[PDB]
Each structure stands twice: as C-alpha cells, then as structure tokens.
Amino acid sequence: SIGQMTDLIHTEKDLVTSLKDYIKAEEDKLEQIKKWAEKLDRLTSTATKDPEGFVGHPVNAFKLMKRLNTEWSELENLVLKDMSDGFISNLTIQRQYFPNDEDQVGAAKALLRLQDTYNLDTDTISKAEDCFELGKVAYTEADYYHTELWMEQALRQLDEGEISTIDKVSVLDYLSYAVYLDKALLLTKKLLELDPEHQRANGNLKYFEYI
Amino acid sequence: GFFTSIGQMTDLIHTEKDLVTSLKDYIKAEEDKLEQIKKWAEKLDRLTSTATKDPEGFVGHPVNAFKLMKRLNTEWSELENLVLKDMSDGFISNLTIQRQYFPNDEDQVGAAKALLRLQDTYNLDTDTISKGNLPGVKHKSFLTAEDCFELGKVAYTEADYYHTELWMEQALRQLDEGEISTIDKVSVLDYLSYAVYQQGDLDKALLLTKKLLELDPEHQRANGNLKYFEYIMAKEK
Amino acid sequence: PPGPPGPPG
Numbered sequence: 001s002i003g004q005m006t007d008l009i010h011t012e013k014d015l016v017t018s019l020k021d022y023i024k025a026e027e028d029k030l031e032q033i034k035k036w037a038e039k040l041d042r043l044t045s046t047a048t049k050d051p052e053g054f055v056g057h058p059v060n061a062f063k064l065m066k067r068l069n070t071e072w073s074e075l076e077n078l079v080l081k082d083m084s085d086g087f088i089s090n091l092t093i094q095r096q097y098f099p100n101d102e103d104q105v106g107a108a109k110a111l112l113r114l115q116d117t118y119n120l121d122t123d124t125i126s127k128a129e130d131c132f133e134l135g136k137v138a139y140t141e142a143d144y145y146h147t148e149l150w151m152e153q154a155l156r157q158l159d160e161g162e163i164s165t166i167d168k169v170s171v172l173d174y175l176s177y178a179v180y181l182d183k184a185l186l187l188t189k190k191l192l193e194l195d196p197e198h199q200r201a202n203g204n205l206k207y208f209e210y211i
Numbered sequence: 212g213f214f215t216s217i218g219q220m221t222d223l224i225h226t227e228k229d230l231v232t233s234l235k236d237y238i239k240a241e242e243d244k245l246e247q248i249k250k251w252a253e254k255l256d257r258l259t260s261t262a263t264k265d266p267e268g269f270v271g272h273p274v275n276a277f278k279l280m281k282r283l284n285t286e287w288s289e290l291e292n293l294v295l296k297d298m299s300d301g302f303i304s305n306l307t308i309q310r311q312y313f314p315n316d317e318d319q320v321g322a323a324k325a326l327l328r329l330q331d332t333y334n335l336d337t338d339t340i341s342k343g344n345l346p347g348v349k350h351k352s353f354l355t356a357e358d359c360f361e362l363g364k365v366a367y368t369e370a371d372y373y374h375t376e377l378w379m380e381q382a383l384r385q386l387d388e389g390e391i392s393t394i395d396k397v398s399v400l401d402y403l404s405y406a407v408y409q410q411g412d413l414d415k416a417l418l419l420t421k422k423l424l425e426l427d428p429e430h431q432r433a434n435g436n437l438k439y440f441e442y443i444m445a446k447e448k
Numbered sequence: 449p450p451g452p453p454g455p456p457g
Contacts, residue, residue: 005270005279012283013259019252022294023245030241035232043227046350055220058329059340059352061323064220066361068227068313076306079237079299091291096437098283107277114273130281367456401456408453432454439450 011094022087036075040067106142108137112146122153131157132166133173144178151175169195176201190196226309233302237427240298248293258282282312327374337381339448356385363402375406396425404436 047054051094099107110124111134115125122131135150137143151171158168172191176184191198262269269275326340333346341359343351354362359382366374383399386392404419417440423433 001272002267005276006266008279008283009259009262009266009270012255013263015287016252016255016259019255023249023252026241026245028217030238033234033241034238037238039229040231044224044231047224048228051221051224052217054222057345057348057352058322058326059343059345059354061220062319062326062362063352063358064223064227065314065322065352066318066358068223069315069319072230072306075234076303079234079302084294088291088295091287098287099280100284104277104280104284107273107280110273111277121372130278133281149342157255164256170382405453405456408457434457435451439452442450 008097010098011097015091017093018087018090022084025083029081030077033075033078036078105137108134112138112143115146122149123156126153126157128154128157128162128164129132129166132164135178139174139178144180147174148178151178169198169201171172173198173201176204181211184208217275223312223314226312230306230309233305235297237302240301244293244296244298245320248290251293320365320368323362326362327366327371330374337377338384341381342383354381356382356390357394359385360394360399363399363406367402367406372406372409372411376410379403379406397423400426401430402434404433408436408440409416411446413440416440417444 047060055064114120115122131150131154135147135154138146138150151174154166154171155168155175158164158171169191172187176187176191180185185205185208188201188208191201192205197202248272254367271281329335329345330337330340335345337359339345341354343353349384359378363375363378363382366372366378379402382394383396383403386394386396386399400423401421404416404423407419420433420436420440423430424437427433
C-alpha cells in the first residue's frame, strides 16, 4: 500500500526529531559530567602532588569529607539519569504501526517479482547486505536461480570495496549450493582459500572431486 | 589518631583519583556511543528529507519500499539497541565498591568543627579563612558560599549560634559580592536571623528577617518571626 | 500574643 506509507514516513521523520532531542539531551548531560570530571581531575592532581600537606589543610579536609559524602552521590545520580526515556517510550508507541518481519519479506518478494517483471539484471538493479538477504530469501523458497544471481551480485559489490557486516564466507557457501560441478567446484575452492576453517566447505570439495 | 586521620584522608585521595579515572573512561565510552548514534541520526536525516520531498513517487518503486520496510523493522531496532546500551556499569560497579571506604556524616562534621576550632584558636574572622589567608600556609584553598552555608549549619545543629551567625554572614557576603552558588540568600537569612535571635540581638534579628521578606514576602516563618520580634520589643518597655 | 521562632532548622 502507499497511503499507509505516507503516514509511516511522517512517523519516521518525527522519530528522527525525537532522536535529535535525545542526542542533544545526552550531550548536555555528557558535558556536565565532563566538567565535573575535569574539576575533580585538577583537585586530585594538585593533591597527589603532595597528599599529606593537602589533606593537612583543614579547608581541604572539610572539602574532602563533603565531596565524598555528598557530591559524588550527586554525580552518580547524574551518571545514572537515563536520557532516552522520552524517546524510547515514544518509539514503543510509534512501533504499533511499524511493519514487521512479514512485511519486510513481502516487499523483498515483490522486489524479486519486479526484477522478474521488467527483466532487470543484477548489475542493473543495484545501480550488499541487502543483496545477501535477497539471495537467501530465494534460497529459502528453493529458488536456486535467484540465489546464484544474488550471491554473485553481493560478491561483485564486496570485491569492489563496499565493506559490510556480512561475512563473505556465508555468501559463498550458499552460492556453491546455488550453482548446484565446474562453477560449484570453483566457488568452493574459492571459499576455502580465504577461510580454511569451514567444515562444510572442505568435505563437499572432497565430495566434488570424487564425482 | 591524628596521624591516622591524615593517613585515612591520604588513602581517600588516592581512592578519589582512581574514581576519576573510572569516570573519564565512562565519559569516553558515552562519547563513542553518542558519536555513532549521531552519525546514524544524520544518515537517517538524509534518507527522510529526500523522501519527504516526493513521498509518493518514492514509495511506489518497490525496491525503495523494501528499503523502507527494512529500516523500521530492522535498522531502528538496532538503533534502539545501541541507544539503550548502558555504558556506565564499569564505573558504577567500581564506585559502589568504593563507597564502603567513604567517610560518613560524622567525618564531615568533624572536619567542619576542626575549621571552627582553628578559627577560634587563631582568632580569624571568617572572610580570612574563606579567602585562604591562613597563618602562613600555601597553598591557598577556598570556601564557596555553599561551603560557608554548610559550616553555618554544622554549628547550628550543635546550637552554636556564634559560629552559625558568623558563617551565614560569610556565605551571605559572598552571595552579595556576586558568587554563583546553589545556595540562595533566603536560606541563609533564615538561619542567620535565627542565630542572631538566640544570641539576644533583637534589633539585628528584626532587620534581617525584614531583608528575607524583601526577597520572599510570603516566607511563612519570617512573617511569624517579624510579628514576634516586634511584639517582644514593644513589651521590653 | 505571637509565638516564638521555630528552627530554620
């Protein structure tokens, strides 16, 4: 649907502003905690220079007893004050109208369909973790065709230096399955050169050899 | 023990320095999380500003919609996760552990009383002590108006209105010269007018209560003290 | 007749 979405972006922008308020508030608390730390850092440095003389001063002793007894407690409370309560409560409230796992696969599956409807090639569509998710959605549906296309597309994006949270090894294992000997044997050998510690990579390559 | 008093404060100083290191590492951890979140929010600002300038054309192409679904379903949770991550536990654990070794209320009055005792002992006016001019000694150390207020309060609890009067005046002077402080003049005049009353300076107590009411005309006790003072004085005649 | 000052206190 679309009209529903228009309300969602509205929700998301308004969430970004609330997110902006959270950031500003944490920053102020962080700034306060830092100023206090610097002051304490100076007194403790001056004091450490000559400890006995320092506490030796009746004014410093009184100041010392009070700071430990009263002031560090006020500092702790600030440290403990959570600044995210307003934002987090709001996000929870806005989250009723969020799509869920089933919506995300719905839009993903739709994408596969669109790739299919207008015959866009994998190079064409992107112009990587995203790519990884898609190869896997097809694989789940035993769509080994789209799995091959998509793992190959992710690798293309990774080799081209797009650092991503996905480990390349997870990508090549499914792809070698996806090919399913020559492309499979080649990709499996490719998997094992970078990461020798993959169990199911080794035993299969050994299995590929006998056939 | 006199030398065990100093040994205890010296140990307390080393403990307090270490609390500062633990505190600085905490600050360092918050700054890193906040900077990540800040980058992340800005990135989200870009995605949303560009979306909002043509929301309908944007949402129809399903690849974008896919992207829209994933961000709310997945990326905003990762962010909630990052946002909710507490960075203070290392510091708090350490502090919780160190408070076993902290002084209590009693150690704080003791240090206050030692100040009162040196003042009495060397015959110092309060402004001299507060300004750090003690019998030659370097280095100078100083009292805030709020420190003065606290000393005034320690004396008060012992019903020592002589020192109560003295220190409240010192606090008051410093607020009047323009010191920024968490303590307010009304609190000081409250205690001050009172100490002046115990000591039998009816005139001074009346005047000071009037100064308080100038700042706080609905101060309940000060209004009561005003009527009272005026009554006894008319009757001393 | 008025009452005496309470603790500030």
